[PDB]
Design a binder for this molecule. Structure first.
Ligand code: SF4
Ligand code: SF4
Ligand code: FES
Ligand SMILES: [Zn+2]
Lengths: 105, 687, 181, 73, 112, 93
């Protein structure tokens, strides 16, 4: 009812820039944009009242773009799809390091 | 099989392709690919340290060794070209043993620092030790040790962790264009350093943190603050300039902890500038939290939203419509600019413009204020002519693409403007419009260089837009563009470089300054985040309302302060200098009693008695569809349709005033960076 | 009676339309069946002389959000006569009722109530299907993957009303998700 | 006394740990390298850390804060 | 007594919908006594809320969904009568007994 | 003479079109043929030419107090689009 009209983002998380390994891609997430948190005035702990605080990152997951879209539409959420960026493999040669500079101009 | 990471492979021709076998399976790769790249197409992840796709091949870490049939030795796949009929094996006992032996050598002198090391938990060395070399350690001797080096306030150094991959050295020479890092000495005693005591001054210096596979180079402002497993990742865009670099924002609770690059091959290619990387600490300092109105004693007092809007709404109705002026800030999203433009127009005023040099330009044709070659298209250009523009401090990732093109394709660069420090070869042609007059008339080696150019590129800075002779200069440049066939159906080489994230969308929406002197005759000024406008030009009896998240001078002058959300707390639309539209994603909550900018202008309009036909951001984007529909079709690459031929001829004269620098301080350009500790330290020692 | 004999003998004797998938493994012999055949397959295995599966160890549900039929219902069964275990699984969705096996194994009664409580799968001919674990008036099915860990409501004593009442949850410190992948 | 310590230490009777480790004099070492374990029994200390002493300023163990210097040069 | 099979058609489903509505309405006096609502709300208001609930779901065309809604309604009703969780103006999930909405939401918070 | 008076009647004229669609072909022909003269006769009037991949051709005019009027340009020829300009200039302005 109340939590079924929130709008979500369906996306496939990119690769971390701090590591060269590509083993965390291919997954599709549903982002609930839970951005209502504050500090508890006793210990400084981070508080929330939003039930979808971490379920979008901890438990819910999808192996395909279609599966995430189907799940969102069955529950009635308004979704926007962000297509992932992919690298373009280009021709690289080690011999390029020693390319001739040509005749002196 | 899906290529690793979903990587795309482009084929110039199906005839120019070869067949290799990766673990029996058959893959087809372009001619010239390496064994490692063939393995990625096969979907096999080879371990690596010294190899980086955006850097020259080094082949020194020896971690990418694989077995090749009829090859007597293990083969470094990162450097070995792929050949037809090649049989590549990656999981054989020879390849596995090679990986374990190399991983043993890597950890021999590595310090037991994982607990105190910031790379812990996101470390390639940790993950590859767990996977490939599962050796019980047998090294019992004394480890070597290295002293730490000082590289400035951004890059913290723990050099005992360095594995001598030389990624940092190669990045400094090839990408940053500032040759400060080297590898000194010989043998196991070789050390990465600058030899003499010097700080890393390049504006792309912070990228060495991302490329260092171990914790040898880390972010000093982020030191020890968090572990990677406790950070929420948000994929969004940067608003520090008009480039729209793709970024990942890491947050823990209601707080941004760091900003790291996101891959976007068309814009920034997994690099960002130091302003993008280290401005985040200003997001929690000097935030406007509550609506404030100045008291009887001329002091701000906090109030509720209802009282603040009532005051603004009451007093706006006591001035003539022509005396109302609205100025949009450089970090304004397209939605808030549209609501601002509607509100001011519905009050009977036409004085709405975006702060900056491009305040009153002709926005009729979209080619006239965008980089029509596109950022990725600059790599095909064989000549660059820069007029009134310092891309190094104006658009750092655009300057990066030029340097990469000059280094790779040996392109030539002509520069017309005030003297500057470039990180690439550039002839200084002159300083002002006299050199444009000479370039138009020919009889110059660069002029025949410009003619002998197959794909030349002209880049004209938005800073020249605020000059009195802007139309004379624009006509002179557009005449040069025609004379050398710069603009053709296969090559659009005319470019205009914008400086501000909001500038492209402001021009698309029609926020154009009609009256050049409407600010000095105004009694109601609405500064929507416009902290860089000269506030002493406003009459002392004018009612000024400042709406934003930070501020230094306009805050002092304002009679009412309306707290607004920042780019990390809202879903706003931004268009970059090449016409590409993108939207930010909320990462953290908004501080205090702040609100979204489009919400504040719609709320004020309702209080002021004007009924705008929308109550939500979807109804604002429907409204935008009637004005600038490209800003609602997000992430869509679209060529121009009209060119300079439609422009009415100009006969204005030229001012001998030489071109002025636009960005005086690369680190002090917006209100977020002006509230940042790190940017202040960067201005102090890195400038 | 080893798992080699069960796999082979079940292939020869069972009607072919019942079983769509057969997995022989050291993790367990598994028979996947359509929902309309689950009751008959379980009655065959119980009564047949060469199987004598007399004990239903338990019934559990598994949630697979990426599947068209998201729920998998798993029947772990045991033959004390032949000292062998068998796993019979079937798939279900949020609205399709499946057959109850209480008439075959009385122990299934509470387990099917737990499946209804935890996942929302309903069982035809179950004599008394109602929630068994959750609080009275509970909304949702906590074992579904989209159900939040801390739920939606919490209880407290309310002195003005002199009773314990339920209100929307407010967390002093949120669950911290540590993504270690 | 510093800002880092004032976030948690609300008692000024004793000195802060940062003050206390600053008063331990640097240890003279005959050589250019020293290994620090933080304890006489290595199993009760911290992971072994090898520290280079080529710089004039004393070298700090990154785990326990002990400082070391070259004895002769 | 046992859970019946899934309804074949919307006639079977509607017969079940009518049967449930009758049971829900016939328990209204019991509820009024348990929650002491004699001075709070009228019995017809209880009837209207039940018929409302049913009318909001008049666009469902799948008999399986209708059966699940009836089952959930039967479960909800049984808890209200047997295990009452008394709250003043609330029975189970039913509240018993010049500016637009935007400016009100704007005044409240930034999250709508 | 109405073409030299578009500045005193409206504050801004917007022309939305598609770059490649055939439905936008007449409007693109209109812009390429008329923009030069219109801008030369109205140097201070903003004429916003905004192209998008999938928009039906439209034409907008903004008057005082932010009142706007739109003309649907689908299924129209070049001279009739010119008339749609003139009626926008002469009526409601
Ligand atoms: S780089 Fe840091 S985290 Fe990685 S192995 Fe070395 S000490 Fe451990
Ligand atoms: S400092 Fe880092 S990037 Fe540079 S050589 Fe050492 S390990 Fe490689
Ligand atoms: S990755 Fe090929 S040798 Fe370092
Ligand atoms: Zn120590």
């Amino acid at each position: 009812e109340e939590h079924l009209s929130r709008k979500v983002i369906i996306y496939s998380p990119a690769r971390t820039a701090t590591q060269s390994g590509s083993g965390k891609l291919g997954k599709w997430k549903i982002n609930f944009v839970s951005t209502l948190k504050w500090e508890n005035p006793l210990m400084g702990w981070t508080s929330t009242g939003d039930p979808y605080a971490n379920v979008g990152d901890s438990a819910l997951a999808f192996d395909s773009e279609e599966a995430a879209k189907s799940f969102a539409e069955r529950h009635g959420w308004d979704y926007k799809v962000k297509k992932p960026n992919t690298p373009l493999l280009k021709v690289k040669s080690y011999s390029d390091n020693f390319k001739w500079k040509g005749n002196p101009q | 099989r899906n290529p690793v990471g979903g990587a795309r492979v482009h084929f110039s021709n199906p005839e120019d392709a070869i067949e290799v076998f990766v673990d029996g399976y058959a893959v087809k790769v372009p001619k010239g690919f390496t064994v490692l790249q063939a393995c990625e197409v096969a979907g096999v992840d080879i371990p690596r340290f010294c190899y980086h796709s955006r850097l020259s091949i080094a082949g020194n870490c020896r971690m990418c060794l694989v077995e090749v049939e009829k090859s007597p030795k293990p083969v470094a796949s990162c450097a070995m070209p792929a050949l037809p009929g090649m049989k590549i094996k990656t999981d054989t006992p020879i390849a596995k043993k090679a990986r374990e032996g190399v991983m043993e050598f890597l950890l021999m002198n590595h310090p037991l620092d994982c607990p105190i090391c910031d790379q812990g938990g996101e470390c390639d060395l940790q993950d590859q030790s767990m996977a490939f070399g599962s050796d019980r350690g047998r090294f019992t001797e004394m480890k070597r040790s290295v002293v730490d080096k000082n590289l400035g306030p951004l890059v913290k150094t723990v050099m005992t962790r360095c594995i001598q991959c030389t990624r940092c050295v190669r990045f400094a020479s090839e990408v940053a264009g500032v040759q400060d890092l080297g590898i000194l000495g010989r043998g196991s005693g070789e050390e990465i350093g600058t030899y003499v005591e010097k700080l890393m001054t390049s504006e792309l210096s912070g990228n060495v943190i991302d490329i260092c596979p171990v914790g040898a180079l880390t972010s000093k402002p982020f030191a020890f603050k968090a572990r990677n497993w406790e950070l929420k990742a948000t994929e969004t865009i940067d608003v520090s300039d008009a480039v729209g670099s793709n970024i990942r924002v890491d947050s823990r609770g209601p707080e941004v902890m760091r900003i790291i690059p996101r891959l976007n091959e068309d814009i920034n290619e997994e690099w960002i500038s130091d302003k993008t990387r280290f401005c985040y600490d200003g997001l929690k300092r000097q935030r406007l939290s509550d609506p404030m109105i100045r008291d009887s004693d001329g002091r701000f007092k906090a109030v509720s939203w209802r009282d603040a809007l009532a005051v603004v709404g009451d007093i706006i109705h006591q001035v003539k419509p022509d005396e109302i002026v609205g100025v949009a800030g450089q970090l304004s999203d397209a939605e808030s600019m549209m609501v601002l433009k509607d509100f001011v127009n519905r009050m009977g005023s036409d004085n709405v413009w975006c702060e900056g040099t491009a305040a009153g330009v002709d926005a009729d044709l979209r080619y006239s204020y965008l980089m029509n070659t596109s950022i990725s298209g600059l790599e095909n250009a064989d000549l660059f002519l820069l007029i009134g523009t310092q891309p190094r401090v104006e658009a750092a990732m655009v300057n990066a693409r030029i340097c990469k093109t000059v280094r790779a394709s040996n392109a030539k660069v002509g520069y017309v403007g005030p003297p500057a420090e470039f990180n690439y070869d550039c002839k200084h042609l002159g300083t002002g419009p006299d050199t444009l007059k000479e370039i138009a008339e020919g009889r110059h080696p660069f002029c025949t260089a410009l003619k002998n150019a197959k794909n030349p590129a002209i880049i004209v800075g938005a800073g020249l837009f605020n000059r009195t002779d802007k139309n004379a200069i624009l006509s002179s440049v557009e005449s040069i563009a025609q004379a050398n066939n710069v603009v053709r159906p296969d090559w659009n080489g005319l470019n205009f470089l914008l400086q501000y994230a909001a500038q492209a969308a402001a021009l698309d929406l029609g926020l154009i300054q009609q009256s050049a002197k409407a600010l000095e005759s105004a009694k109601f000024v609405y500064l929507m985040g416009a902290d860089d406008v000269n506030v002493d030009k406003i009459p002392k009896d004018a009612f000024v309302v400042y709406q934003g998240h930070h501020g230094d001078k306009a805050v002092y002058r304002a009679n009412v302060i309306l707290p607004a959300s920042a780019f990390t707390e809202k879903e706003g639309t931004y268009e970059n200098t090449e016409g590409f539209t993108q939207q930010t994603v909320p990462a953290v909550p908004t501080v205090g009693d702040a609100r979204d900018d489009w919400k504040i202008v719609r709320a004020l309009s309702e209080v002021s008695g004007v009924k705008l036909p929308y109550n939500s951001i979807e109804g604002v984007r429907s409204r935008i569809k009637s004005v600038a529909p490209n800003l609602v079709h997000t992430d869509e690459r679209e060529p121009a349709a009209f060119g300079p031929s439609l422009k009415p001829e100009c006969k204005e004269a030229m001012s001998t005033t030489p071109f002025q620098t636009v960005v005086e301080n690369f680190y002090m350009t917006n209100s977020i960076t002006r509230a940042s500790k790190i940017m202040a330290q960067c201005s102090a020692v890195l400038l | 009676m080893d798992n080699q004999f069960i796999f082979k003998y079940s292939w020869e004797t069972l009607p072919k339309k019942w079983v769509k998938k057969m997995e022989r493994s050291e993790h367990g012999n598994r028979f996947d069946t359509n929902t309309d055949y689950l009751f008959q397959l379980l009655c065959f295995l119980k009564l047949h002389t060469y199987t004598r599966v007399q004990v239903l160890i338990d019934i559990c549900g598994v949630d697979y959000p990426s599947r068209k039929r998201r729920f998998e219902v798993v029947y772990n069964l045991l033959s004390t006569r032949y000292n062998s275990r068998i796993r019979v699984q079937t798939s279900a969705d949020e609205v399709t009722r499946i057959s109850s096996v209480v008439s075959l194994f009385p122990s299934a009664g509470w387990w099917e109530r737990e499946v209804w409580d935890m996942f929302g799968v309903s069982f035809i001919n179950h004599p008394d299907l109602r929630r068994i674990l959750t609080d009275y008036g509970f909304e949702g099915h906590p074992l579904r993957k989209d159900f939040p860990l801390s739920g939606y409501v919490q209880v407290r004593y309310d002195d003005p009303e002199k009773r314990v009442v339920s209100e929307p949850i407010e967390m002093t410190q949120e669950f911290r998700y540590f993504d270690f992948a | 006394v510093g800002n880092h310590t004032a976030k948690w230490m609300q008692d000024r009777s004793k000195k802060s740990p940062m003050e206390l480790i600053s008063e331990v004099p640097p240890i003279k070492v005959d050589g250019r390298i020293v290994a620090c374990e933080g304890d006489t029994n290595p199993a009760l200390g911290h992971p072994i850390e090898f520290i280079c002493l080529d710089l004039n300023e004393p070298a700090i163990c990154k785990y326990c804060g002990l400082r070391y210097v070259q004895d002769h040069h | 007594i046992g859970v019946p099979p899934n309804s074949a058609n919307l006639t079977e489903a509607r017969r079940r919908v009518f049967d449930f509505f009758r049971a829900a309405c016939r328990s209204i006096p019991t509820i009024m006594d348990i929650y002491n609502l004699q001075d709070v709300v009228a019995p017809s208001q209880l009837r209207y809320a039940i018929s409302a609930q049913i009318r909001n779901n008049a666009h469902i065309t799948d008999p399986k969904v209708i059966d699940l809604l009836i089952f959930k309604g039967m479960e909800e009703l049984t808890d209200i009568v047997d295990h009452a969780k008394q709250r003043h103006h609330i029975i189970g999930q039913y509240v018993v007994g010049g500016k637009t909405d935007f400016l009100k939401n704007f005044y409240t918070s930034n999250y709508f | 003479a109405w073409r030299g008076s578009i500045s005193k009647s409206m504050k801004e004229l917007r022309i939305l079109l598609c770059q490649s669609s055939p439905a936008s072909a007449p409007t693109r022909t209109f812009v390429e043929k008329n923009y030069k003269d219109l801008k030369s006769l109205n140097p201070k009037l903003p004429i916003l030419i905004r192209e998008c991949s999938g928009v039906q051709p439209q034409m907008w005019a903004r008057y005082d107090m932010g009142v706007e009027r739109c003309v649907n340009l689908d299924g129209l020829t070049e001279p009739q689009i010119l008339k749609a300009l003139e009626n926008l200039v002469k009526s409601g302005a």
